[PDB]
Swiss-Prot record, chain A:
Family statement drawn from the similarity comment of this UniProt entry: Belongs to the universal ribosomal protein uS14 family.
A Pfam family matched in the record: Ribosomal_S14
Full protein name: Small ribosomal subunit protein uS14
InterPro entries hit by this protein: Ribosomal_uS14, Ribosomal_uS14_bac/plastid, Ribosomal_uS14_CS
tRNA processing as UniProt keyword: no
Recorded GO MF terms: rRNA binding; structural constituent of ribosome; tRNA binding
From Swiss-Prot, chain B:
Keyword annotations from UniProtKB, A to Z: Ribosome biogenesis, Transcription, Transcription antitermination, Transcription regulation, Transcription termination
Protein name: Transcription termination/antitermination protein NusG
Entry note about domains: The N-terminal domain interacts with RNAP and the C-terminal domain binds either to Rho or to RpsJ (NusE). These domains are separated by a flexible linker.
InterPro entries linked: KOW, NGN, NGN-like_dom, NGN_dom_sf, NusG-like, Rib_uL2_dom2, Transcrpt_antiterm_NusG, Transcrpt_antiterm_NusG_bac_CS
Gene3D superfamilies: 2.30.30.30, NusG, N-terminal domain (3.30.70.940)
Any one Gene Ontology BP term: DNA-templated transcription termination
Record bears the keyword Transcription: yes
SMART domains: KOW, NGN
Subunit field text: Monomer. Interacts with the transcription termination factor Rho and with RNAP. One NusG monomer forms a stable complex with a Rho hexamer. Binds directly, but weakly, to the core enzyme of RNAP. Also interacts with RpsJ (NusE). The rRNA transcription and antitermination complex (rrnTAC) consists of RNAP, NusA, NusB, NusE (rpsJ), NusG, SubB, ribosomal protein S4, DNA and precursor rRNA; S4 is more flexible than other subunits.
Organism: Escherichia coli (strain K12)
A Pfam entry, by short name: KOW
CDD domains cross-referenced by the UniProt entry: KOW_NusG (cd06091), NGN_Bact_1 (cd09891)
Swiss-Prot record, chain C:
Subunit structure as annotated in this protein's UniProt entry: The RNAP catalytic core consists of 2 alpha, 1 beta, 1 beta' and 1 omega subunit. When a sigma factor is associated with the core the holoenzyme is formed, which can initiate transcription. The rRNA transcription and antitermination complex (rrnTAC) consists of RNAP, NusA, NusB, NusE (rpsJ), NusG, SubB, ribosomal protein S4, DNA and precursor rRNA; S4 is more flexible than other subunits.
Binding positions (Zn(2+) 1): 19, 21, 34, 37
Domain of life: Bacteria
Family per record: Belongs to the RNA polymerase beta' chain family.
Function of the protein: DNA-dependent RNA polymerase (RNAP) catalyzes the transcription of DNA into RNA using the four ribonucleoside triphosphates as substrates. Resistance to the antibiotics salinamide A, salinamide B, rifampicin, streptolydigin, CBR703, myxopyronin, and lipiarmycin can result from mutations in this protein.
Biotechnology comment: Co-administration of salinamide and rifampicin or salinamide and myxopyronin suppresses the emergence of resistance to both antibiotics.
Taxonomic path: Bacteria, Pseudomonadati, Pseudomonadota, Gammaproteobacteria, Enterobacterales
Source organism per UniProt: Escherichia coli (strain K12)
Protein's name in the database: DNA-directed RNA polymerase subunit beta'
Swiss-Prot record, chain D:
Name recorded for this polypeptide: DNA-directed RNA polymerase subunit beta'
Organism: Escherichia coli (strain K12)
Lineage: Bacteria, Pseudomonadati, Pseudomonadota, Gammaproteobacteria, Enterobacterales
Subunit: The RNAP catalytic core consists of 2 alpha, 1 beta, 1 beta' and 1 omega subunit. When a sigma factor is associated with the core the holoenzyme is formed, which can initiate transcription. The rRNA transcription and antitermination complex (rrnTAC) consists of RNAP, NusA, NusB, NusE (rpsJ), NusG, SubB, ribosomal protein S4, DNA and precursor rRNA; S4 is more flexible than other subunits.
Modification note: Acetylated on several lysine residues in the presence of glucose.
Sequence similarity: Belongs to the RNA polymerase beta' chain family.
Applications (biotechnology): Co-administration of salinamide and rifampicin or salinamide and myxopyronin suppresses the emergence of resistance to both antibiotics.
Annotated coiled-coil segments of the chain: none
Protein purpose: DNA-dependent RNA polymerase (RNAP) catalyzes the transcription of DNA into RNA using the four ribonucleoside triphosphates as substrates. Resistance to the antibiotics salinamide A, salinamide B, rifampicin, streptolydigin, CBR703, myxopyronin, and lipiarmycin can result from mutations in this protein.
Length: 100, 154, 50, 50, 98
DNA sequence: CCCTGTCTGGCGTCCTCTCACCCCATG
DNA sequence: CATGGGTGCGCCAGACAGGG
């Protein structure tokens, strides 16, 4: 669609996989069933200083070439015409037209 | 005080050299001038007189002492260097080495057709004592189960 | 010997174009080194220069 | 190459190289084991003479 | 107890792969229980083809999947030895679970 | 330092034709 | 089975001590 939206995902994949791909205890487990004193509330206070773009909620699985937001499929990581773009020129193994 | 010395024998007849040395001691009855004999090198607890030096070199199948000179041959680097060498040999037979494979870790195979090959342990089974590691054989990863001793930790 | 005074991988195969035993007994893939045997795949006078 | 009988009549250089490699393996093992000074001096001296 | 699983798509290329690994094991180990297959596996996906309209053009494609299991009977130190870094089938995923 | 004695090395003809025999030794 | 350590040649010549 646009190079700028494809420029969003390279920034998106970077800072998210700085914290929210490996460091998961500080973002998930630290507010589980423990005492309701404000120290685990102090844990999510540190969660504000990080970029909110770095959350995995930001994850938009995009077309790697042209960046199309809607009509996606995860089994190829592609847009809905790219799976035909390899179906009709054979760039994907086993991808046969279902003649059922 | 009896200090240690190193004797060279014909390598292979070493136990017979040790027995003949004990027997020459109990023949020429310089019993107060020899402590032990440890086992191609023979370790001797000894003192240094020229008589005892001629005694040890008159023991058959013995070349001579090994030291700085042949006038006054040399005790050892450490006080119990002979005992240290014996302990190192014993530790060498034990050969304790890093040999295992855990989840997300490269390992080494040295047994079976997969010997001389490396791989990673995708799954581990401490209860079954088996590591799930695949070997890059002809490109395709060959997930095979190897024991901790069958493979070494990389 | 596997890796001795008279090795296979370090020098070459005794037989001409034969790798070692069960591998390459024709004239197609001259060079492949099977894990079955660390060995070169060349002629018979190749060891004289190596 | 062997003789008529079959026992291999070995060359002299194989004795020389096999001696140097036997002594070099012994010297690597003694420097692994941290033998004392006079042992590795005799070992390196035997390698020098070999 | 020793399993040789083979994982690919088509049965028209794995069919020479089950021939190469039972016979080369026969010359060296001769200890195998025979190929026991697995149900054929289907991944069908209907996808829209018109560039910006018309939710009717859905063409069915499928990445087909097949699995075949060899299962040699005895841990042979000759079958594995000769067939370690050896697999005729190209573009295939071999799983020699020992 | 300038001559004198010693100590080790380097070397000694070319072609052929048979023969005989090539590391013990052993716990 | 596999490894592990004689005493009859004579000249030249230069390097190494050895006086000198």
């Amino acid at each position: 669609a646009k190079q700028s939206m494809k420029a969003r995902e390279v920034k998106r994949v970077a800072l998210a996989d700085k914290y929210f791909a490996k460091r998961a205890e500080l973002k998930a487990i630290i507010s589980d069933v423990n005492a309701s004193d404000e120290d685990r509330w102090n844990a999510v206070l540190k969660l504000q200083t990080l970029p909110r773009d770095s959350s995995p909620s930001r994850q938009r699985n995009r077309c790697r070439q042209t960046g199309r937001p809607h009509g996606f499929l995860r089994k190829f990581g592609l847009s809905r015409i790219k799976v035909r773009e390899a179906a009709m020129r054979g760039e994907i193994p086993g991808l046969k037209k279902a003649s059922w | 005080k009896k200090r240690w010395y190193v004797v060279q024998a014909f390598s292979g007849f070493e136990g017979r050299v040790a027995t003949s040395l004990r027997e020459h001691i109990k023949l020429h009855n310089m019993e107060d001038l020899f402590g032990e004999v440890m086992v191609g090198y023979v370790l001797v607890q000894m003192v240094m007189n020229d008589a005892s030096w001629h005694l040890v070199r008159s023991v058959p199948r013995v070349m001579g002492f090994i030291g700085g000179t042949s006038d006054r041959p040399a005790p050892i680097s450490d006080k119990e260097v002979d005992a240290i060498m014996n302990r190192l040999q014993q530790v060498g037979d034990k050969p304790r080495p890093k040999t295992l494979f855990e989840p997300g870790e490269m390992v080494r195979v040295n047994d079976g057709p997969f010997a001389d090959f490396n791989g990673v342990v995708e799954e581990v089974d401490y209860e079954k004592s088996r590591l799930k590691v695949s070997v890059s054989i002809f490109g395709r990863a060959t997930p095979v189960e190897l024991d901790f001793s069958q493979v070494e930790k990389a | 010997e596997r890796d001795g005074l008279f090795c296979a991988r370090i020098f070459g195969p005794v037989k001409d174009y034969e790798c070692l035993c069960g591998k390459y007994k024709r004239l197609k893939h001259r060079g492949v080194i099977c894990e079955k045997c660390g060995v070169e795949v060349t002629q018979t006078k190749v060891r004289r220069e190596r | 190459v062997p003789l008529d009988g079959g026992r291999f009549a070995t060359s002299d250089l194989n004795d020389l190289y096999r001696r140097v490699i036997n002594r070099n393996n012994r010297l690597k093992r003694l420097l692994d084991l941290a033998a004392p000074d006079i042992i590795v001096r005799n070992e390196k001296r035997m390698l020098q003479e070999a | 107890r020793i399993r040789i699983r083979l994982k690919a798509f088509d049965h028209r290329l794995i069919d020479q792969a089950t021939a190469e690994i039972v016979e080369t094991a026969k010359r060296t180990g001769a200890q195998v229980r025979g190929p026991i297959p697995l149900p054929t596996r289907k991944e069908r996906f209907t996808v829209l083809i018109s560039p910006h309209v018309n939710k009717d053009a859905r063409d069915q494609y499928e990445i087909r999947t097949h699995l075949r299991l060899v299962d040699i009977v005895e841990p042979t130190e000759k079958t594995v030895d000769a067939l370690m870094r050896l697999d005729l089938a190209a573009g295939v995923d071999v799983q020699i679970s020992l």
